[PDB]
Every structure is written in C-alpha cells, then in structure tokens.
Structure 1
Amino acid sequence: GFHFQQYIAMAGRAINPVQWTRAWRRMEGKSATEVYRDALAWTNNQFAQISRASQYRAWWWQNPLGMGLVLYGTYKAWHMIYMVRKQKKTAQLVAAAYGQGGQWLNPVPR
C-alpha cells in the first residue's frame, strides 16, 4: 500500500464541483473505452509500483506483518465507516417498523 494521502486528495477533488465542469470539458472527444483503459492503467501502475518497490524499499509503516497490516487496516476502516453506518440505519429502521430484534422473531404460533 501507498499514497493514501493522494487518494484522499483525489476524493476531495472529485467531490469538488468545479472539477465536475473541468471533467465535463475534458470529456470532449473521448470514448468510454479510453476512460476505462486509463482507469485500469492507473490501478495497474499503483499495483506495479508496489510489486517493484517492495523488493528494496520500506515504508514508515513497515512491520513484521508487512503490507498485510495496512490492507487489514484499510478493510477495517471501510467496515467501520460504511458497513457499521448501514447497520445503524438498518437497526433504527427495524426498531421503528417491528421493534428491536423484530427481524429475528419466531413465526406466529399455530
């Protein structure tokens, strides 16, 4: 893993509306195949940088588990930021519709 700060900055630029107009202008004379190939090439460049530079270079976060810990941290951040938020919303929804635990209730007895 690497360039997390650059990724945050990319997300910021993406949400900035002015960049929406800039991208609208850049998309003049452009194809979906070209856009897809460019994105795929960017991702491949990132992963190739990793594969090459891990052989001789060590980041500030280097540890006896290597990039496994950084990847687990990315996963855990994604989890706590998105999935647990969705769980909170679903919990409030279920509590308003059926009551807390309503989705695990037993079938009506016959």
Structure 2
Amino acid sequence: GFHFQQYIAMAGRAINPVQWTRAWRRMEGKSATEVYRDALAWTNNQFAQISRASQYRAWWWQNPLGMGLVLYGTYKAWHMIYMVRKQKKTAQLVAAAYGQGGQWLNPVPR
C-alpha cells in the first residue's frame, strides 16, 4: 500500500463539481474502452509500484507483518465506515417495523 493521501485527494477532486465539468470537457472524443484501459493501467501501475518497491524499500508504516497489517487496516476502516453504518440503519428500520430482535423471532405457533 502507498499514496493513501493521494487517494483521498483524488476522491476530493472527484467530488468537486468543477472537476465534473473538467471531466465532461475531457470526455470529448473518447471511448469507454479507452477509459477502462486507462483505469486498469493506473491500477496496474499502483500494484507494480508495490511489487517492485517492496523488494528494496520500506515505508514509515513498515512492521513485522509487512503489508498484511496495512491491508487489514484498510479492510477494517471500510467495514467500520460502511457496513456498521448500514447495520445501524437496518437496526432502526427493523426496530421501527417489528421491534428489537424482530428478524430472529420464532414462527407463529400453530
């Protein structure tokens, strides 16, 4: 992993409506195949930078587990940001619709 700050900055630029107009203008004379190939090349460039530079270079976050810890932390951040938020929303929905624990209730006795 690397360039997390740059990834945040990319998302920040993407959410800017001015950058939406810039991309609209840049999209003149352009194909979906070209866009997909560009994105794939960018991702390959990232992973190739990793594959090459891990052989000789160590980041400030280097640790006895290497990139496993960075990838675990990425996963956990994604989890806590998205999935637990969704769980909160689903909990309030179920609690308003059936009550707490309504999805694990037993079938109605016959």
Give TM-score, length-normalised by structure 2: 1.00
Give TM-score, length-normalised by structure 1: 1.00
Render the CA deviation track for 1:38-65: whole Å, top value 9, x for unaligned: 0000000000000000000000000000
Q: How many residues align?
A: 110
% identical equivalent positions: 100
How far apart are 1:81 and its partner, in Å? 0.1
Question: What are the residue-to-residue correspondences of 1:1-110 with 2, within 5 Å?
Answer: 1-110=1-110
Q: In 2, distance between residues paired with 1:92 and 1:109?
A: 26
How far apart are 1:97 and its partner, in Å? 0.3
Render the CA deviation track for 1:57-88: whole Å, top value 9, x for unaligned: 00000000000000000000000000000000
User: Is there any run of 5+ residues in structure 1 with no aligned partner, and where?
Assistant: none
SS at match of 2:69: helix
How far apart are 1:29 and its partner, in Å? 0.1
Moved over 2 A (4+): none
User: Is there any run of 5+ residues in structure 2 with no aligned partner, and where?
Assistant: none
Q: In 2, distance between residues paired with 1:13 and 1:93?
A: 34
